[PDB]
Design goal:
about 70 residues; Histone H1.2; DNA-binding; 1 chains; alpha+beta; about 45% helix; part of a larger assembly
DNA sequence: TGTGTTTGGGAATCCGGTGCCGAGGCCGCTCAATTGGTCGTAGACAGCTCTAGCACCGCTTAAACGCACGTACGCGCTGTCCCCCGC
């Protein structure tokens, strides 16, 4: 399954008012058996694609270093 | 979500009493500083030599300088996780 679903599912499972950090996303995907080490660069890209698709709102920071929430709009 | 100000409250500080022991003074003594004198020599001074430090010049080339260009490291920001702190 593509990493955009795994990320969206992790952000939905950890839904809050702040927003899953990249470190929490790493932890959730690793707990989901996804190798976050080798494919970290893929994650940053896929995450960026999800922000560029507007599917994730950046709530703090800039780019992948930030916190993110599912764009309910 | 943020922050100027509030206010009871522990913690450091000030003040007065007090008492106690060491610092300051006094005395008797002694031994080390002082006086005077002799004598030896350490070094102050003159004087002489020669070396090695300074100033200069010219030439070559290697290093320093300025500049273009790119990337990688420093630094700021965010997050988390845990391990020292206060009690």
């Amino acid at each position: 399954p593509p990493v955009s679903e795994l990320i969206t599912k992790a952000v939905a499972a950890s839904k809050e008012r702040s927003g899953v950090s990249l470190a929490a996303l790493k932890k959730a995907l690793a707990a989901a058996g996804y190798d976050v080490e080798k494919n970290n660069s893929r994650i940053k890209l896929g995450l960026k694609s999800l922000v560029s698709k507007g599917t994730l709102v950046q709530t703090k920071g800039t780019g992948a270093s930030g916190s993110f929430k599912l764009n309910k709009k």
